[PDB]
Amino acid sequence: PIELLPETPSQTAGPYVHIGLALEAAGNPTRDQEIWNRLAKPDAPGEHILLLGQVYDGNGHLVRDSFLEVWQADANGEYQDAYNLENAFNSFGRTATTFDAGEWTLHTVKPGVVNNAAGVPMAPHINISLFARGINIHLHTRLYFDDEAQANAKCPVLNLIEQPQRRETLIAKRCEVDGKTAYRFDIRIQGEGETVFFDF
Amino acid sequence: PIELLPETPSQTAGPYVHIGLALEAAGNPTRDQEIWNRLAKPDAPGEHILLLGQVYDGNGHLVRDSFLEVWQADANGEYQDAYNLENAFNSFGRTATTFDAGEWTLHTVKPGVVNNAAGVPMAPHINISLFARGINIHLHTRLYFDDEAQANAKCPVLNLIEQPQRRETLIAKRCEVDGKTAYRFDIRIQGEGETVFFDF
Amino acid sequence: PIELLPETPSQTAGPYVHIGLALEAAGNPTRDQEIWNRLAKPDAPGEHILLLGQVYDGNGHLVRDSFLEVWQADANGEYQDAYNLENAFNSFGRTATTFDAGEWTLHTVKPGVVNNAAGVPMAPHINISLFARGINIHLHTRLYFDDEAQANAKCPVLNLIEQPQRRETLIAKRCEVDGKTAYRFDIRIQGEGETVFFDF
Amino acid sequence: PIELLPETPSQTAGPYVHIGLALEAAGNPTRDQEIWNRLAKPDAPGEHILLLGQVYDGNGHLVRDSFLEVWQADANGEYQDAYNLENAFNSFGRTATTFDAGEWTLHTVKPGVVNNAAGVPMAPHINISLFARGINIHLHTRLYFDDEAQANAKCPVLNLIEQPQRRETLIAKRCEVDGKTAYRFDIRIQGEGETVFFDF
Amino acid sequence: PAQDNSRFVIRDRNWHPKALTPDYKTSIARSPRQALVSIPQSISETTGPNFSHLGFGAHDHDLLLNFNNGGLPIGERIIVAGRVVDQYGKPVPNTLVEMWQANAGGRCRHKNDRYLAPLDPNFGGVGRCLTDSDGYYSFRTIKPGPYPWRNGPNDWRPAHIHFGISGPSIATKLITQLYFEGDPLIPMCPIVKSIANPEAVQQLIAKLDMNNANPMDCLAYRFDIVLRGQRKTHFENC
Amino acid sequence: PAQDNSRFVIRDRNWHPKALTPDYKTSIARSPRQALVSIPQSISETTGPNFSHLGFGAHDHDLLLNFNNGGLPIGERIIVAGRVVDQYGKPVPNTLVEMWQANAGGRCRHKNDRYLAPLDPNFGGVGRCLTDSDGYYSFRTIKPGPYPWRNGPNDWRPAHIHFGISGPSIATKLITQLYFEGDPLIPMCPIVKSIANPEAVQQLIAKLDMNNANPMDCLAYRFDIVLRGQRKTHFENC
Amino acid sequence: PAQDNSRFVIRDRNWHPKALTPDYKTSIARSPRQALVSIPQSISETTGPNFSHLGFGAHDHDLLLNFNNGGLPIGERIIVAGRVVDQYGKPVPNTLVEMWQANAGGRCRHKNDRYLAPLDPNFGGVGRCLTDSDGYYSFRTIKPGPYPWRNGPNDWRPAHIHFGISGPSIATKLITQLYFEGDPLIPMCPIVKSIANPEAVQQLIAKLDMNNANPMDCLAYRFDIVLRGQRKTHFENC
Ligand SMILES: [Fe+3]
Ligand SMILES: [Fe+3]
Ligand SMILES: [Fe+3]
Ligand SMILES: [Fe+3]
């Protein structure tokens, strides 16, 4: 069979991943430009939302050293790839859960609808990659919104998950935090209620 | 030591086992003569019973593509090996749970008693092989009856299972379906309340 | 691939093949029973014919040490396999061309029609195997009659030969020898006019 | 010594070459644009000629499944490499003999003169590649004209063939087909009068 | 009726595929976590159905003609033959062999298969043959195509034919799969790879069999199936 | 017009198949007996047609759609791709690649083929693609079946696809055949065996290419074709 | 009369000696130049004579007594015995084996042998034996000696016995030669070199069999013959 060069193998990001990529959250001095949890500046188009959550291990204890990276379309359903701190909206961002913040948070807009390769619309979603000590290769998942029930139900990606009860673990539950529209999304790594993870 | 030819290895039966061993259940045209789930004709001797059950995976989800083959003694405790569609009783049959039927059923008689190789009687039982997609090698179990508690208590096979609570998993619960004598035997492949499986 | 045991390889019959199988033609004393060139005794059913010919090498000189074996149906198109010197007709026989007989001869009957494996009639024919010093594995051919032109033309074996001119080399030319119906059939081993040979 | 990558090996073109390179000739539907046997349109410059010939095997039998590709200069001696169906002249074409047509034909112009790498003129010629079932690697020849005996006598290529009588095999005989100027060029693959083939 | 006069050689559970083989995704939640409970053989285990009287139609084993809607299937015509013996090499006569398979394009005639290769209107894909006195069986069918399935993101099943074999008892019954000699998709498959020992994988590869082919018609393949050895009981319960 | 500014590396005639290879029966009477006459290259030999302007239809290279009578062909859907380079490894761009082949069952859509496997009404079997700037070509088709032929009494052609490649000149033109990785009929073939060196046979075997497959759709194969190396003339006629 | 119920495995013509083997000189002008035509097997090729009723004389397989002119032959007394099977390993009972060979000095009893080694007044050199139920045959004879012949200027045929075997059909009939273990002339013989494969030559070598020898009497060689494998027809004309 044709063999190409093999990819460089993955290793765990380690306990100190915050020093190289979550400079602020490790309380080390920053540089002029850091990639962080503010995808949209307060004047970007769309419906502004705050996302928050916790991550669990399989004993149900909190993962306080995890590091996340998110990639979502803007409110028009367009991916913005030229990362710039001056833009109003960036499609990429990074967050973390620390010993002092058991919780991560991200500030962004509800993403607009994008289609898959066959032409079929996907429900609005945010792609998430999770890294942490103990995770040898990172975990891929999608966060979806509990208020988009109809689109969620015709989603060609959510419909590849066989068991209906598994599809729920990907649905963020709407709530409010000081007059701002927020969604919670916990991640269970292992066990009862195990979040669905992807391979692509 | 002495080595014989190796047995050909097993392989899972696959999602499509219906097309080859459960023709009707897969909604394909049948042949004249099929091996199916009616072990006993209406005028066969013994008590007529309907069996029924569900198959669960380890996440508590239903196995809808399972296929089962049963082997049991008649009412006078004799194994009828000559398979013929014109007998009043055949000791063998097959059933399947379908996307359609999450549930399998079998029409037969309650088996009579048989002795083990040492001459000790075994409680009335049905021998079951389970096959499905995800099962590399089939799984062997026995279906016993809750109304035969005296014989189940002295069965030399059920007594080889060390933990009493594990013994219970092989006892079918008497019930009534369309007010006709029935027993339910669900199987748990994995987890909490996991059904005992044998090796022989 | 499945390999069976290999066949014992062929060697040339050699210059002295007559001592083991053409006892008479080598002018050595015979035994009580010899296999020879008289397939039909004068009272066997059918049209009695005499066949004769010569064999050529590729320089056009005569092969005087060749040995032939023939197998043909009787006049009813039936193969007679139980070889017996008392029968009126035998389907098998042997002849030879010697230093003193540059010519072979056989006495038999015109064979009747047999069908091939698909049901299709073959024109009347006689199967010939030719052996001699210089021939490392024997040569298979068929002798056909020039007076059976119509059957010859619908013959499924003669029609596998691509080139029409090659088909002629298999056709024996009718003639008469002292009031007896004879056919000549020369064999050219190599060269101009090369007799068709088969593999089966 | 220095070794380069090896050239991929040839394989015979097979009996069915028509289905891939001679669509019409195999009586399959053609595509819009096909490469065929009309090198010149009616209003192209040069003398219009029809070429024709037969291909014989070594038994003097006709090759009915052959396929030929020709390459020639135009009338002013220039090679027109830009293949287009809208030109008045293309220097390339294909033809085939069929079960139907034992004979191939080509409509073109008589080529003008070209020089060899040393500046010496070559006589007018057509370059021909022959492919067929039984030919493992195609065979290269040149078609020259009998009415150009003065130039054929001084061709630096035809003079590399040592034996004069061998030179003759590449000279097409002028003739008339439906009273239109034509040349016949038959090819003998093997035997008596075998056409010269080249290696370059 | 059936008598207890046979014992069967224990199975080699490290030769066969284990229940938990994670690269084959569906096995995660479909394999037990508790150990199998071993039990002595009795009449229940050592007897099984005899299929000599089941009524077989005339094209039960010929898949080129048993589905038929006025036509021949499209694909490589092949004979799949072999012998069923037990571990001692003793032939298993009058035993039920059942098989099923995709079409030339890898499509299964089952409602659940949505792969984009079309159904062939002259092919069903099921056959059954009862072994003869020397344990021989034979089928005539077309060679199945490989098909994509949803395990890894680009997993394909090598071409295969599923087989069910009864044998003499419920202790010998076995479902397996046949692969085709040479197929480069074989070592890549997670289902084939549920088998840890590579010598066990080789027993599942049917070999090209030129000696059983019909010239100018169809090729063949030879697949021999070895079931558990059968032995008379001796010195039991003294 | 065309200019003489190229020379091509001599062919290796012991690498390629010889003309007389008796086990391939038709070659007996179709191979010369005289020696080939060697000649220097000139403009006649070193130039050849350029096919950049030939008009290609849209499905010329897609055999799943180019014959079409409202349907998909039956058989294994596959991509056959590769690159054409010369002996120095230099890519051959804008070159004509043509191929032809049987259907899933080994039947050729040609009047002359009488094999009993049926014609598929949605398959023709011809494609053509012009190589891109880096020498790449690609086809989409179904995997051909093997077929019986009348050479020896039970000879079968392994599955194959014929290929024609122009290159830059008539000196580089080549017709060959592609085989499929793993096929056990390959070493048995007298036509493949017309090639004496086994390393030359390996160049004709297309490899399974999982990296170019479309998941849940079709597999691929990679077949690279190396044509004669092309070099600038130097120091000629002083 | 005979019925068409068998097919025979095809011959491997690269295993057997080819027709044109130039060091064996007479093969030059006696080998065809056109290819053999292949034809399918019919009742003509699949039936053959059966000799179960030929009347064998009682000494026909015993060459120490069947020529007899008052005494015994001079030379090494040996039994030559073995079995005839088919390629599937199945014995071939009631077949005719014929054999002819020289005397202890290499002279053949024939008009044309003018070799100067004399004739043996008590040896003729011919035997025939029908094989038993089990495929066994046997002869008793003397070991023949080598003989020079007119091939190259100093060629010696090794010691040998010619065999002729019928089998069940004119498709299986064969003529061959038996050589003797360790003869240093075996590998220099052009007739033996007409077989290209060294493992095909080993099957023509009879091996010393001390187990079958009569103590204080004669030695024994074992020679086993394998004929084309015989199978029942299957799936024919559908
Ligand atoms: Fe570290
Ligand atoms: Fe399958
Ligand atoms: Fe001899
Ligand atoms: Fe072909």
Side-chain angles (χ1 to χ4, degrees), chain A residues 1-172 174-200, chain B residues 1-172 174-200, chain C residues 1-172 174-200, chain D residues 1-172 174-200, chain E residues 1-2 4-231 233-238, chain F residues 1-2 4-231 233-238, chain G residues 1-2 4-231 233-238:
Chain A
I2 270 99
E3 310 292 16
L4 264 9
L5 312 168
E7 201 186 4
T8 289
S10 182
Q11 301 267 254
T12 174
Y16 303 132
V17 75
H18 308 101
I19 80 114
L21 322 152
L23 277 82
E24 181 132 57
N28 272 314
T30 63
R31 300 148 288 179
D32 284 21
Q33 303 208 15
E34 297 298 325
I35 289 161
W36 206 238
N37 86 336
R38 217 153 243 106
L39 284 69
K41 268 166 175 189
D43 71 299
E47 178 193 343
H48 294 249
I49 74 213
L50 165 91
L51 305 160
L52 86 307
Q54 297 172 313
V55 174
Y56 297 83
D57 69 27
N59 293 319
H61 308 126
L62 285 175
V63 172
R64 292 143 183 305
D65 42 5
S66 88
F67 165 74
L68 300 71
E69 293 194 330
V70 298
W71 175 244
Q72 65 164 79
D74 64 18
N76 292 318
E78 280 196 328
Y79 280 95
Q80 295 315 327
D81 71 321
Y83 192 90
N84 203 331
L85 291 197
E86 259 163 2
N87 305 324
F89 183 74
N90 283 297
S91 257
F92 179 83
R94 278 188 165 156
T95 180
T97 67
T98 91
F99 276 82
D100 317 302
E103 221 149 54
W104 49 271
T105 58
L106 197 61
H107 293 272
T108 181
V109 301
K110 185 158 231 234
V113 168
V114 316
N115 295 319
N116 68 10
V120 188
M122 290 184 285
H125 59 276
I126 290 184
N127 302 298
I128 293 177
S129 295
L130 167 71
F131 309 76
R133 54 195 262 268
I135 283 161
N136 301 314
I137 169 158
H138 63 289
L139 302 170
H140 297 290
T141 202
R142 273 172 172 215
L143 172 174
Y144 275 91
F145 306 94
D146 71 359
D147 69 347
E148 294 274 348
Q150 268 167 59
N152 296 349
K154 299 219 251 262
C155 192
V157 156
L158 231 30
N159 278 288
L160 282 175
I161 291 145
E162 319 203 24
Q163 280 315 306
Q165 317 87 142
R166 294 209 83 231
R167 289 173 195 159
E168 295 188 303
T169 67
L170 296 195
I171 287 115
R174 195 169 207 174
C175 62
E176 288 179 56
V177 151
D178 296 325
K180 181 56 142 13
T181 328
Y183 300 86
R184 195 166 179 94
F185 188 44
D186 295 334
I187 294 177
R188 320 217 154 47
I189 279 122
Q190 175 186 113
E192 173 205 58
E194 205 169 296
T195 309
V196 169
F197 295 109
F198 299 124
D199 188 6
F200 49 83
Chain B
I2 299 291
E3 315 292 17
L4 267 8
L5 321 167
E7 184 185 4
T8 291
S10 185
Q11 295 273 272
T12 168
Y16 306 126
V17 58
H18 305 93
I19 76 148
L21 301 173
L23 277 69
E24 190 186 28
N28 279 356
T30 60
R31 273 157 326 185
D32 265 85
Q33 286 212 35
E34 295 284 347
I35 291 151
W36 209 241
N37 77 348
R38 217 105 213 170
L39 281 59
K41 250 130 196 240
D43 60 321
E47 171 181 355
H48 295 235
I49 64 165
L50 176 65
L51 308 185
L52 68 56
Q54 286 169 323
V55 196
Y56 295 96
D57 60 20
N59 286 326
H61 302 129
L62 288 170
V63 182
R64 303 165 203 265
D65 47 16
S66 92
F67 168 74
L68 287 81
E69 290 188 325
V70 310
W71 181 237
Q72 59 169 95
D74 60 27
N76 310 313
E78 270 167 19
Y79 278 102
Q80 304 298 340
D81 66 342
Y83 202 89
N84 186 331
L85 292 187
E86 292 180 311
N87 312 331
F89 187 64
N90 281 303
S91 257
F92 189 73
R94 309 235 246 202
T95 192
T97 56
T98 81
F99 264 88
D100 281 41
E103 203 154 72
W104 44 271
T105 67
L106 204 96
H107 305 265
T108 177
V109 311
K110 194 186 192 162
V113 169
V114 307
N115 285 303
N116 75 354
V120 191
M122 281 178 296
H125 66 275
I126 296 193
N127 293 295
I128 300 190
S129 295
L130 163 76
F131 303 74
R133 163 193 158 224
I135 303 183
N136 298 331
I137 186 162
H138 57 296
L139 288 179
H140 296 294
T141 204
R142 278 170 170 208
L143 175 155
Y144 287 87
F145 319 83
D146 59 6
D147 53 2
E148 302 270 345
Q150 242 140 74
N152 292 345
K154 313 268 250 260
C155 188
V157 150
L158 224 25
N159 286 311
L160 289 159
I161 297 162
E162 312 185 39
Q163 292 297 321
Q165 317 84 123
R166 286 220 81 215
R167 285 181 204 155
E168 291 173 343
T169 79
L170 311 183
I171 285 123
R174 194 190 190 153
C175 74
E176 305 153 339
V177 160
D178 275 85
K180 145 66 178 341
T181 298
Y183 296 87
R184 170 171 217 110
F185 187 54
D186 292 344
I187 288 182
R188 309 219 138 69
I189 292 149
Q190 167 196 117
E192 199 194 26
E194 177 178 304
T195 316
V196 166
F197 291 110
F198 300 116
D199 187 11
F200 50 88
Chain C
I2 270 99
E3 310 292 16
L4 264 9
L5 312 168
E7 201 186 4
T8 289
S10 182
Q11 301 267 254
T12 174
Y16 303 132
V17 75
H18 308 101
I19 80 114
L21 322 152
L23 277 82
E24 181 132 57
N28 272 314
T30 63
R31 300 148 288 179
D32 284 21
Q33 303 208 15
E34 297 298 325
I35 289 161
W36 206 238
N37 86 336
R38 217 153 243 106
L39 284 69
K41 268 166 175 189
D43 71 299
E47 178 193 343
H48 294 249
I49 74 213
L50 165 91
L51 305 160
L52 86 307
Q54 297 172 313
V55 174
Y56 297 83
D57 69 27
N59 293 319
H61 308 126
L62 285 175
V63 172
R64 292 143 183 305
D65 42 5
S66 88
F67 165 74
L68 300 71
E69 293 194 330
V70 298
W71 175 244
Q72 65 164 79
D74 64 18
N76 292 318
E78 280 196 328
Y79 280 95
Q80 295 315 327
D81 71 321
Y83 192 90
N84 203 331
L85 291 197
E86 259 163 2
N87 305 324
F89 183 74
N90 283 297
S91 257
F92 179 83
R94 278 188 165 156
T95 180
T97 67
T98 91
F99 276 82
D100 317 302
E103 221 149 54
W104 49 271
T105 58
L106 197 61
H107 293 272
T108 181
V109 301
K110 185 158 231 234
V113 168
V114 316
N115 295 319
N116 68 10
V120 188
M122 290 184 285
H125 59 276
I126 290 184
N127 302 298
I128 293 177
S129 295
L130 167 71
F131 309 76
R133 54 195 262 268
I135 283 161
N136 301 314
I137 169 158
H138 63 289
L139 302 170
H140 297 290
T141 202
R142 273 172 172 215
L143 172 174
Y144 275 91
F145 306 94
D146 71 359
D147 69 347
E148 294 274 348
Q150 268 167 59
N152 296 349
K154 299 219 251 262
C155 192
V157 156
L158 231 30
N159 278 288
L160 282 175
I161 291 145
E162 319 203 24
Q163 280 315 306
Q165 317 87 142
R166 294 209 83 231
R167 289 173 195 159
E168 295 188 303
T169 67
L170 296 195
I171 287 115
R174 195 169 207 174
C175 62
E176 288 179 56
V177 151
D178 296 325
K180 181 56 142 13
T181 328
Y183 300 86
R184 195 166 179 94
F185 188 44
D186 295 334
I187 294 177
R188 320 217 154 47
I189 279 121
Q190 175 186 113
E192 173 205 58
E194 205 169 296
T195 309
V196 169
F197 295 109
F198 299 124
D199 188 6
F200 49 83
Chain D
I2 299 291
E3 315 292 17
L4 267 8
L5 321 167
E7 184 185 4
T8 291
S10 185
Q11 295 273 272
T12 168
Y16 306 126
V17 58
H18 305 93
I19 76 148
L21 301 173
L23 277 69
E24 190 186 28
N28 279 356
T30 60
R31 273 157 326 185
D32 265 85
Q33 286 212 35
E34 295 284 347
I35 291 151
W36 209 241
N37 77 348
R38 217 105 213 170
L39 281 59
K41 250 130 196 240
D43 60 321
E47 171 181 355
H48 295 235
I49 64 165
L50 176 65
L51 308 185
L52 68 56
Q54 286 169 323
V55 196
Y56 295 96
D57 60 20
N59 286 326
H61 302 129
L62 288 170
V63 182
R64 303 165 203 265
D65 47 16
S66 92
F67 168 74
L68 287 81
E69 290 188 325
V70 310
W71 181 237
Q72 59 169 95
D74 60 27
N76 310 313
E78 270 167 19
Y79 278 102
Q80 304 298 340
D81 66 342
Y83 202 89
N84 186 331
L85 292 187
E86 292 180 311
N87 312 331
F89 187 64
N90 281 303
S91 257
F92 189 73
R94 309 235 246 202
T95 192
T97 56
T98 81
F99 264 88
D100 281 41
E103 203 154 72
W104 44 271
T105 67
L106 204 96
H107 305 265
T108 177
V109 311
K110 194 186 192 162
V113 169
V114 307
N115 285 303
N116 75 354
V120 191
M122 281 178 296
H125 66 275
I126 296 193
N127 293 295
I128 300 190
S129 295
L130 163 76
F131 303 74
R133 163 193 158 224
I135 303 183
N136 298 331
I137 186 162
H138 57 296
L139 288 179
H140 296 294
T141 204
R142 278 170 170 208
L143 175 155
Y144 287 87
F145 319 83
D146 59 6
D147 53 2
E148 302 270 345
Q150 242 140 74
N152 292 345
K154 313 268 250 260
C155 188
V157 150
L158 224 25
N159 286 311
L160 289 159
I161 297 162
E162 312 185 39
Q163 292 297 321
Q165 317 84 123
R166 286 220 81 215
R167 285 181 204 155
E168 291 173 343
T169 79
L170 311 183
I171 285 123
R174 194 190 190 153
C175 74
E176 305 153 339
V177 160
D178 275 85
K180 145 66 178 341
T181 298
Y183 296 87
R184 170 171 217 110
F185 187 54
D186 292 344
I187 288 182
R188 309 219 138 69
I189 292 149
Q190 167 196 117
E192 199 194 26
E194 177 178 304
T195 316
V196 166
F197 291 110
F198 300 116
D199 187 11
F200 50 88
Chain E
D4 177 43
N5 51 34
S6 260
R7 282 315 166 248
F8 291 86
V9 167
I10 287 335
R11 276 191 164 124
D12 183 357
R13 273 165 192 289
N14 274 300
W15 177 255
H16 269 297
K18 293 310 206 178
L20 181 56
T21 45
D23 294 338
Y24 171 28
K25 303 188 172 184
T26 308
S27 82
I28 300 174
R30 287 168 194 214
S31 39
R33 293 300 181 263
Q34 295 301 297
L36 305 200
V37 182
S38 286
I39 36 159
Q41 300 165 2
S42 93
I43 195 162
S44 274
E45 292 77 37
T46 59
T47 50
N50 180 274
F51 299 98
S52 291
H53 301 130
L54 193 82
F56 299 93
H59 304 327
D60 284 3
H61 60 114
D62 188 341
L63 276 75
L64 255 35
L65 302 176
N66 69 25
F67 182 83
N68 180 204
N69 281 295
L72 252 23
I74 290 149
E76 317 178 25
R77 299 152 63 77
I78 57 159
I79 289 337
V80 174
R83 185 180 203 201
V84 185
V85 299
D86 77 2
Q87 289 184 285
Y88 292 101
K90 149 154 171 272
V92 180
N94 313 110
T95 224
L96 187 53
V97 193
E98 291 181 276
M99 45 87 117
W100 63 101
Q101 52 160 107
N103 72 8
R107 184 66 180 280
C108 289
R109 187 177 275 283
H110 180 307
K111 281 116 322 275
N112 280 155
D113 184 23
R114 317 310 332 147
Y115 177 53
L116 57 164
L119 280 163
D120 181 324
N122 301 113
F123 194 68
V126 194
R128 17 135 107 129
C129 174
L130 184 87
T131 59
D132 68 5
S133 337
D134 298 278
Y136 285 96
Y137 63 90
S138 97
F139 288 105
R140 179 211 206 209
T141 179
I142 47 97
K143 202 213 227 206
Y147 58 85
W149 62 301
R150 298 218 125 97
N151 183 71
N154 186 26
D155 274 348
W156 284 79
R157 293 276 12 260
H160 62 284
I161 295 195
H162 293 267
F163 265 81
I165 324 337
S166 55
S169 77
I170 60 156
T172 63
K173 153 91 193 198
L174 182 77
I175 276 173
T176 185
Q177 280 170 59
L178 169 158
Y179 308 96
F180 291 90
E181 191 178 3
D183 192 339
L185 288 162
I186 293 165
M188 291 164 192
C189 186
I191 290 166
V192 170
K193 286 174 10 246
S194 76
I195 299 200
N197 195 147
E199 257 101 50
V201 166
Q202 289 286 326
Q203 248 184 102
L204 291 190
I205 293 168
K207 307 210 141 71
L208 186 58
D209 192 1
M210 309 295 249
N211 315 306
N212 234 48
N214 280 353
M216 299 299 311
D217 175 355
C218 66
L219 288 164
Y221 287 84
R222 176 86 177 189
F223 170 75
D224 288 344
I225 294 134
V226 172
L227 303 181
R228 293 158 69 174
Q230 182 160 20
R231 81 157 154 88
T233 60
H234 50 26
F235 303 107
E236 269 185 47
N237 331 300
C238 265
Chain F
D4 177 43
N5 51 34
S6 260
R7 282 315 166 248
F8 291 86
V9 167
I10 287 335
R11 276 191 164 124
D12 183 357
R13 273 165 192 289
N14 274 300
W15 177 255
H16 269 297
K18 293 310 206 178
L20 181 56
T21 45
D23 294 338
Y24 171 28
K25 303 188 172 184
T26 308
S27 82
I28 300 174
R30 287 168 194 214
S31 39
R33 293 300 181 263
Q34 295 301 297
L36 305 200
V37 182
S38 286
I39 36 159
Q41 300 165 2
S42 93
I43 195 162
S44 274
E45 292 77 37
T46 59
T47 50
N50 180 274
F51 299 98
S52 291
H53 301 130
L54 193 82
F56 299 93
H59 304 327
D60 284 3
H61 60 114
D62 188 341
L63 276 75
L64 255 35
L65 302 176
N66 69 25
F67 182 83
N68 180 204
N69 281 295
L72 252 23
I74 290 149
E76 317 178 25
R77 299 152 63 77
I78 57 159
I79 289 337
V80 174
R83 185 180 203 201
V84 185
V85 299
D86 77 2
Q87 289 184 285
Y88 292 101
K90 149 154 171 272
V92 180
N94 313 110
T95 224
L96 187 53
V97 193
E98 291 181 276
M99 45 87 117
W100 63 101
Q101 52 160 107
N103 72 8
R107 184 66 180 280
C108 289
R109 187 177 275 283
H110 180 307
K111 281 116 322 275
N112 280 155
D113 184 23
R114 317 310 332 147
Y115 177 53
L116 57 164
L119 280 163
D120 181 324
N122 301 113
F123 194 68
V126 194
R128 17 135 107 129
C129 174
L130 184 87
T131 59
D132 68 5
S133 337
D134 298 278
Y136 285 96
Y137 63 90
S138 97
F139 288 105
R140 179 211 206 209
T141 179
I142 47 97
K143 202 213 227 206
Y147 58 85
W149 62 301
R150 298 218 125 97
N151 183 71
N154 186 26
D155 274 348
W156 284 79
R157 293 276 12 260
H160 62 284
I161 295 195
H162 293 267
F163 265 81
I165 324 337
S166 55
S169 77
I170 60 156
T172 63
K173 153 91 193 198
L174 182 77
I175 276 173
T176 185
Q177 280 170 59
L178 169 158
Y179 308 96
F180 291 90
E181 191 178 3
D183 192 339
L185 288 162
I186 293 165
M188 291 164 192
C189 186
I191 290 166
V192 170
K193 286 174 10 246
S194 76
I195 299 200
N197 195 147
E199 257 101 50
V201 166
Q202 289 286 326
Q203 248 184 102
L204 291 190
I205 293 168
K207 307 210 141 71
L208 186 58
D209 192 1
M210 309 295 249
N211 315 306
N212 234 48
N214 280 353
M216 299 299 311
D217 175 355
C218 66
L219 288 164
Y221 287 84
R222 176 86 177 189
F223 170 75
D224 288 344
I225 294 134
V226 172
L227 303 181
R228 293 158 69 174
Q230 182 160 20
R231 81 157 154 88
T233 60
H234 50 26
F235 303 107
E236 269 185 47
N237 331 300
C238 265
Chain G
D4 168 40
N5 39 61
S6 308
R7 295 293 171 260
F8 289 85
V9 180
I10 298 304
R11 270 179 171 125
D12 178 345
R13 274 161 189 292
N14 284 310
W15 176 251
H16 279 292
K18 289 277 143 225
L20 170 50
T21 47
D23 285 332
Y24 177 10
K25 309 187 159 162
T26 301
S27 87
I28 308 175
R30 287 175 188 215
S31 38
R33 290 288 177 277
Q34 301 301 306
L36 307 183
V37 166
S38 289
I39 54 164
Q41 282 171 16
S42 70
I43 189 152
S44 295
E45 301 99 5
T46 63
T47 51
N50 185 317
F51 298 104
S52 291
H53 305 108
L54 182 62
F56 301 97
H59 291 327
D60 289 351
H61 56 114
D62 190 345
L63 271 86
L64 275 25
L65 316 168
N66 72 21
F67 180 81
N68 205 163
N69 279 294
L72 274 13
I74 291 154
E76 292 171 51
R77 288 158 68 79
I78 54 160
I79 296 325
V80 162
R83 227 197 170 174
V84 185
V85 305
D86 72 12
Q87 288 176 289
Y88 288 99
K90 182 215 173 180
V92 173
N94 316 98
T95 233
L96 172 76
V97 181
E98 292 167 294
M99 67 82 99
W100 55 101
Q101 54 160 111
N103 68 22
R107 178 82 179 270
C108 279
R109 199 175 261 290
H110 172 307
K111 282 106 336 265
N112 311 136
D113 185 9
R114 319 311 310 150
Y115 181 30
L116 71 260
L119 288 162
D120 178 337
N122 298 119
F123 193 67
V126 194
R128 41 144 85 123
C129 177
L130 198 61
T131 50
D132 61 37
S133 316
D134 266 85
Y136 296 91
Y137 73 80
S138 84
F139 298 99
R140 192 186 183 213
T141 182
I142 40 110
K143 198 170 162 207
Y147 51 100
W149 54 306
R150 298 224 116 95
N151 185 73
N154 187 25
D155 285 332
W156 281 87
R157 278 316 322 285
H160 74 277
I161 300 188
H162 286 266
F163 281 61
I165 312 91
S166 73
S169 70
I170 62 168
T172 56
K173 155 83 203 216
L174 193 79
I175 288 298
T176 181
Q177 287 179 55
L178 167 162
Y179 300 95
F180 289 78
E181 176 164 37
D183 203 329
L185 292 167
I186 292 165
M188 265 162 248
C189 177
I191 285 171
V192 168
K193 305 178 320 242
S194 83
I195 290 184
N197 185 153
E199 278 127 327
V201 171
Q202 285 284 318
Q203 260 191 100
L204 297 180
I205 295 191
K207 344 233 94 70
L208 175 72
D209 181 15
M210 288 318 279
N211 312 276
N212 228 9
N214 288 340
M216 313 292 303
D217 186 355
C218 44
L219 284 165
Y221 285 83
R222 179 73 186 207
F223 175 56
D224 291 335
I225 299 152
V226 181
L227 300 181
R228 287 160 70 160
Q230 185 175 352
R231 71 167 175 65
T233 57
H234 59 20
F235 311 100
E236 280 199 33
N237 318 308
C238 233

